[PDB]
Design a protein around this nucleic acid. Structure first.
Ligand code: SF4
Length: 76
DNA sequence: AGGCTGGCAGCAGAATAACCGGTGGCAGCAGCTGACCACAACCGATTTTCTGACC
């Protein structure tokens, strides 16, 4: 079916929870071409997923952050 | 004098209406819990790593 075209499970699944701001960036933008962004993002927002890339967007424990804040002192 | 030998005959089996007492089960439910999620916050370093000034 359309399973190998689905960009979620094409490669290694441990990529999409890597705890670097730059590592998961290609994981987030790899769901640009995903055919099911609407329903996946809708399910992720309704069930309140606390981790990882969902619907081509990252998640905190309840909501969506724009980009994950890096380790260290943030920029003034 | 009967007996035990002989067929002869006959048969089983197989195939193709109430009471009373008591006693234990049981289900329903307030009412101690008491362990348990469970959010939800709040801190305890921890490490990085800028940020800010020092001379
Ligand atoms: S997170 Fe995005 S890319 Fe991955 S399966 Fe869901 S919609 Fe597709």
């Amino acid at each position: 079916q359309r399973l190998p075209v689905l960009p979620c499970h094409v490669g290694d699944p441990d990529l999409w929870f890597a705890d670097t701001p730059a590592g998961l960036e290609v994981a987030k933008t790899l769901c640009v071409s995903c055919p099911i962004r609407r329903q996946c993002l809708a399910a992720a927002l309704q069930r309140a997923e606390p981790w990882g890339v969902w619907g081509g967007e990252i998640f905190d424990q309840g909501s969506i952050v724009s980009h994950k804040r890096p380790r260290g002192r943030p920029r003034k």
